């Protein structure tokens, strides 16, 4: 391929459901609630911290902001529609966009396309691989390890 | 163009509204219901079978999973935000992403960009053409013929 | 880069909240209403005119159709999930897709990736820059200047 730059991004995504300041909010629950899962059709909006380490209080490097939707009638699976926006590193203000299926119950390493980027990631080509560091299905709290491989151009 | 592989995909998308196990669910209906249409602002989540033939019981080849939104005040038109995920063929586990307008009342052949892909379709370039095989606007039941033309790389 | 065509698009986006025929509708308001802002998790569907000039009654060149979501807990910021569809110009029926963060309170020039296109914009590569012409946060009425730079191919 012809891109001028390659970058490996590695960080941890936190969906914080419990506690006094959750990172998300239910947008729609057309099938109500069920224990340990999000019923088909549930939509959640997220403002989720991205950190350098698995720990919530490790260095904040960005936010994953968007919505996820429960899109499977047979198991819990999510559609992620979101940006990853970076704020304390080598591409402050730059973003990556994701529109990807996320089969959190049946795939251990989950691939999502990078469908766009801005700033340093204008015209980006790339992909993301997500895997759990920790998940509690009774509450929804999750810490998700991301590796993103992006090919892009001079800023 | 420079891609190493080309694939023509051809299948049928089923939005099943009637019957004992619909494939979709209303997420939001801010303008209620109207006969034979989805009012502006309506959002539906889908877990829609993709089959090799027009018949519902023909070979299941994947699922179209995501949301569609009624986005026109003047006619019924949809925005599709979804993945197509393939499960019984040459690219099991691979997906394609669509973020496209879908003017089901005023275009007979409807083009939607492939905005991303995974697995076999990592780094994909392509487009989809959709046209009705059958539609019942009084219920919403629809069978939609898809041709997708994708350019991609070795797995 | 290798594209055969380049096009500079310039137009004005109107989100019309006040008046007898708003261009949008609230889809979900999980955190209710607040003065001068859209609370985190709010989703709006839009059928927004695109015009050649800042004036609402200047030449209609297309529609921006999709949803925007309030995705920040700390300031008002939007995720745009939408198509721009053109109707009275050099690419009638063609569309561009956007999946981008839109930090309307903290960035004066806001970049969004073009994540796909159709028709004349099949296989497009490009980006959008948005900046206010006018905004009234007490009502939500906004006129937004867009420049879009797209690289594409013969039709």
Residue numbers in the entry:
A (entry chain A), B (entry chain A), C (entry chain A): 36 to 190
What's the publication's text?
Described herein are the 3D structures of two stereoselective pterocarpan-forming DPs from pea and licorice, which preferentially produce either (+)- or (–)-medicarpin, depending on the substrate. We describe that pterocarpan synthases, containing dirigent-like domains, initially engender mono-QM formation from their chiral substrates, this being followed by intramolecular cyclization (C–O bond formation) to afford entry into the pterocarpan natural product (phytoalexin) class. GePTS1 and PsPTS1, in solution, exist mainly as trimers (∼68.0 kDa), with (because of association/aggregation) a small amount of higher-molecular weight entities also being evident (roughly corresponding to 410–500 kDa). The entrance to the putative active site of the GePTS1 and PsPTS1 monomers is located at the end of the barrel opposite the N and C termini.
The P. sativum “Cam_eor” Unigene set was searched using GePTS1 as query, which resulted in a gene (PsCam039127) being selected as possibly encoding a medicarpin-forming DP. Trivially named PsPTS1, it has ∼92%/85% sequence similarity/identity to GePTS1 at the amino acid level. In our hands, PsPTS1 displayed much lower (∼7-fold) catalytic turnover (kcat/Km) relative to GePTS1, this in part being due to the ∼6-fold increase in Km. The pea medicarpin-forming DP, PsPTS1, structure was solved by single-wavelength anomalous diffraction methods using the signal from intrinsic sulfur atoms (sulfur-SAD (single anomalous diffraction)) in the 11 methionine residues (excluding the N-terminal methionine). Its structure was refined against 1.5 Å resolution native data to a final Rfree of 0.1907. It consists of a single monomer in the asymmetric unit, residues Phe35–Tyr187, plus two residues at the C terminus (Lys188 and Gly189) from the linker for the C-terminal His tag. The extended N terminus observed in some of the GePTS1 monomers is not resolved in the PsPTS1 structure. A trimeric complex is formed by the crystallographic 3-fold axis parallel to the body diagonal of the cubic unit cell, this being in agreement with the GPC. PsPTS1 also has an eight-stranded β-barrel structure, comprised of two curved β-sheets with the same topology as GePTS1 (sheet I: β1′, β2, β3, β4, β5, and β6′; sheet II: β6, β7, β8, and β1). The PsPTS1 and GePTS1 monomer structures are thus very similar, with RMSDs between 0.47 and 0.75 Å for the superposition of the PsPTS1 monomer on the six independent GePTS1 monomers.
